[PDB]
Amino acid sequence: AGSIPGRRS
Amino acid sequence: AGSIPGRRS
Amino acid sequence: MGSMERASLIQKAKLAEQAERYEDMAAFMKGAVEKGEELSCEERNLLSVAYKNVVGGQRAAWRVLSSIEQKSNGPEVREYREKVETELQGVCDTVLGLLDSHLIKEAGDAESRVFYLKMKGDYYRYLAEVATGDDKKRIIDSARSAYQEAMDISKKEMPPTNPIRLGLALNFSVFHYEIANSPEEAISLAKTTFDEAMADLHTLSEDSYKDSTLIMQLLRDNLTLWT
Amino acid sequence: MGSMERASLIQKAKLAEQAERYEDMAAFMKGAVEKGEELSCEERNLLSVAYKNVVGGQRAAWRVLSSIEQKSNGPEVREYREKVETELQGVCDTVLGLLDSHLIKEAGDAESRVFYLKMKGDYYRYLAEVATGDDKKRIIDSARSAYQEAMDISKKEMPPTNPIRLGLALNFSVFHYEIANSPEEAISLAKTTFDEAMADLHTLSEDSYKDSTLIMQLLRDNLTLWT
Ligand SMILES: *Cc1ccc(C(=O)NCC2CCOCC2)cc1
Ligand SMILES: *Cc1ccc(C(=O)NCC2CCOCC2)cc1
Ligand SMILES: [Cl-]
Ligand SMILES: [Cl-]
């Protein structure tokens, strides 16, 4: 189950 | 130009 | 970072992101927040990206060690998992401290207030992932309350395709599924979010359409995994 | 790490490797070295892998920032590159300190002595990559001297297919090409190393054959890039 990756600006 | 990766045991 | 200019901290956070130095990035953005001024949209993204990467690596390490620990059940595996767990909790506490002092109370616009409250829900969710003892229930309720307040504002103030509104609903659905043991609520929220966004896509430019459909695909991926 | 048992430090270094926590890994292995006992073959590998990963991330960050800095030619990019550079130099100095106090002087067997001297050459090579001023020449000569002593021992004491001997020759050839401005020496060393290994493969078991041919392919890849 994926949350928002949110790793790249 | 690659040296020995040497990153994995 | 008290002696560095706010603008220099922001510039160095962007450089750290390019260098994939996320611990530095987080420290620079922490320093920028502590200057006491509100954050722009771009600056909020830098803060979020920095700490998501830092805690993301900690969570991945914790899961590796927790898995090894469960397969074993000396003290070393538990001790080292505890060390990583404590470091993760410290990062979550730091982020929650920044939101509480004083990002959230100064955030009046829907875009900023929903963003910070989503962050608050996320970092309590990460605390909940490792919580066991007397406070797991209180930590879960703290996550739920932050997400719920953000949901209420986003439904009133943002269009159904707004990427912050969509990412908030995505993460709240993950909270329901993974933390709150409410998979039906998770599925219902993801479905309703997806369907209401789909019906609003006709209003968007080509670039906004791309932004929204990307996040809708993440909702769809979860629904496919959950059903 | 003075209060932790040597065996616990080794066990936690292995756990940190599984969790991809290489800074922790390096700190645990530094603590193990400082216990004062010699290191086994496996323990030497753990030490090497830990610090190669740490400095590998620092080198990659430094190259990103150095590239941005050269495209610009405020003080921020230079300042941040300098900060990363200083942290990298500190890690290299730490490793070189461990080799000098007292890994190398206690290493009598060819396998351990060549391993540590190759490490010494490598970490001086990393210092040379960022060096400019009064000591770049001395740093380069320190790398060359360590590599040369390791080469002399490996040619006397190890078969041409030994993976440590092959990886040493590979990295010394990279030193020649990238640091010493001697591409012909680099190519000659890689070719002679490859050819002498190929002629010794018939002596090896299936597993040793796989170990040696893997490193020979790295020599071949460089030769293809250089010719
Ligand atoms: C909380 C939140 C909401 C929305 C976004 C976002 O738009 N991220 C862009 C991502 C990369 C490119 O497309 C998909 C998502 C982040 C965080
Ligand atoms: C200095 C040195 C020499 C040799 C090796 C080595 O054998 N590494 C194994 C690597 C991964 C799997 O195959 C190719 C190389 C490491 C370091
Ligand atoms: Cl520990
Ligand atoms: Cl800096």
- The answer to whether the CB atoms of A7 and C122 lie below 8 A apart is no
Say if C102 falls within a structural domain. yes
Q: What are phi and psi of D91, to 5 degrees?
A: -65, -45
Question: Which run of H or E residues covers position C92?
Answer: helix C76-98
* Residue with the two structure tokens 């060393």: D189
Question: Residue C61 falls within a domain, yes or no?
Answer: yes
**Which residues fall within 8 angstroms of residue C4, CB to CB, at 6 or more apart?**
C12, C31
Let me know how long chain B is: 9
Whether the upstream peptide bond of residue C102 has omega within 30° of 0, thus cis, is: yes
Q: Which residues contact D134 (CB under 8 A, 6 or more apart)?
A: none
Best mutation target, D80, D81, D82, D91, to test chain C (most C CBs within 10 A): D80
Task: Show the tokens assigned to C148.
Answer: 């719920």
Distance CA D81, CA D85 (A): 6
DSSP type of residue C204: S
Quick check: C170 and A3 CB within 8 A? yes
- Cis (ω within 30 of 0) for the bond into D102? yes
CB contact under 8 A, C49 and A3: no
Structure tokens at C74: 């000396």
In a domain, C77, yes or no: yes
Please say whether the beta carbons of C219 and C192 come within 8 A: no
Choose among C18, C24, C76: nearest Cβ to D8: C76
Cα(C121)–Cα(C128) distance, rounded to whole angstroms? Answer: 10
What DSSP string runs through chain D?
-TTS-HHHHHHHHHHHHHTT-HHHHHHHHHHHHHT-SPP-HHHHHHHHHHHHHHHHHHHHHHHHHHHHHHHH---HHHHHHHHHHHHHHHHHHHHHHHIIIIIHHH--SHHHHHHHHHHHHHHHHHHHHH--STTHHHHHHHHHHHHHHHHHHHHHHS-TT-HHHHHHHHHHHHIIIIISS-HHHHHHHHHHHHHHHHTTGGGS-HHHHHHHHHHHHHHHHHHHHH-
Does residue D1 fall inside a structural domain?
Answer: no
Residues in chain D: 227
What are the tokens at C17?
Answer: 């992101």
Q: Could you tell which of D215, D217, D222 is best to mutate to test the pocket of ligand 2, judged by most ligand atoms within 8 Å of the CB?
A: D215
* Distance of alpha carbon C205 from alpha carbon C157, whole angstroms: 20
Distance CA(C18)–CA(D193), nearest Å, equals 38
Flag if C222 and A1 touch (Cβ within 8 Å). yes
Question: How far is residue C98's CA from residue C43's CA, in Å, rounded to a whole number?
Answer: 14
What are the structure tokens assigned to D2, written together?
């003075």
Judging by beta carbons within 10 Å of its beta carbon (0-12, 13-18, 19+), is residue C65 exposed, middle or buried?
Answer: buried
What's the CATH code of the domain at C57?
1.20.190.20
- Asked whether the beta carbons of D15 and C68 are under 8 A apart, the reply is yes
**Which token pair is C153?**
């504002």
The answer to whether residues C52 and C21 touch, using CB atoms and an 8 Å cutoff, is no
Q: Please, what's the b/e burial string for D155-172 (b: 16 or more CB within 10 A of its CB; e: otherwise)?
A: eeebebbbbbbbbbbbbb
- Has residue D97 been placed in a domain? yes
Number of compact structural domains in chain C: 1
Question: Are D194 and D169 in contact, with CB atoms under 8 Å apart?
Answer: no
Contact flag for B and C (3+ C-beta pairs < 8 Å)? no
The neighbour count for residue C226, using CB atoms within 10 Å, is 15
- Judge contact between D24 and D53, C-beta under 8 A: no
Residue type, C202: H
Which helix H or strand E contains C26, and what residues bound it? helix C22-34
Burial class (CB in 10 A: 0-12, 13-18, 19+), C12: buried
3-state secondary structure of A2: coil
Query: Quick check: is D10 in a domain?
Result: yes
Report yes or no on C131 lying in a domain. Answer: yes
Q: What was the elucidation method? A: X-ray
Distances (CA, A) of D225 to D53, D133, D187, D189, D218: 24, 30, 10, 15, 11
**Minimal-distance CA residue of chain D relative to B2:** D222
Domain that holds residue D55: 6-226
**Resolution at which this structure was determined, Å:** 1.8
Which tokens is C101 given? 């002092």
| Burial (Cβ within 10 Å: 0-12, 13-18, ≥19) of residue C138 | exposed
Structure tokens belonging to residue C198: 């789909």
Of D44, D123, D214, the residue with max ligand 2 atoms within 8 A of its CB, to mutate for a pocket test, comes to D214
Joined together, the tokens standing for residue C205 give 């430019």
Closest listed residue to residue D171, CA positions, set D153, D137, D198, D146: D146
C43 close to A2: Cβ distance less than 8 angstroms: no
**Phi, psi dihedrals of residue C35, rounded to the nearest 5°:** -65, -20
Rounded to a whole number of angstroms, the distance from the CA of C21 to the nearest CA of chain D is: 7
Decide: D159 in ligand 2 pocket, CB within 6 A: no
Token pair 């960050």 is at which residue? D61
Percentage helix, strand, coil for chain B under 3-state DSSP, each rounded to 5: 0, 0, 100
Q: What tokens were used for A7?
A: 């790793």
Cis peptide leading into residue C176 (ω within 30°): no
Q: Helix crossing, D110-130 with D163-174: angle to 10°?
A: 20
**Set of chain D residues whose Cβ sits within 8 Å of the Cβ of C84:** 19, 21
Residue of B nearest to D14 (CA): B9
CA dist B4 to B1, D51, D181, Å? 10, 13, 20
Q: What amino acid is encoded at C53 in this protein?
A: N
Note whether residue C1 is domain-resident.
Answer: no
Calculate Rg over the CA atoms of chain A: 7
Distance CA C140, CA C131 (A): 9
Ramachandran quadrant class, D5 (left: phi over 0; alpha: psi -120 to 50; beta: rest): beta
Residues D56 and D47: beta-carbon distance below 8 Å: no
Please, how many CA atoms are within 13 Å of residue D202, restricted to the half-sphere of its CB? 3
Among the listed residues D129, D123, D135, D140, the one whose alpha carbon sits nearest the alpha carbon of residue D54: D123
Q: Quick check: C10 and C32 in contact, CB under 8 A?
A: yes
Ligand 1, atom 2, lies closest to the CA of C167
Distance of residue D61 Cα from the nearest chain C Cα, in angstroms? 5
Residue C220's contacts (CB-CB under 8 Å, 6 or more residues apart) are C194
Residue D25 CA to ligand 1 center (angstroms) comes to: 33
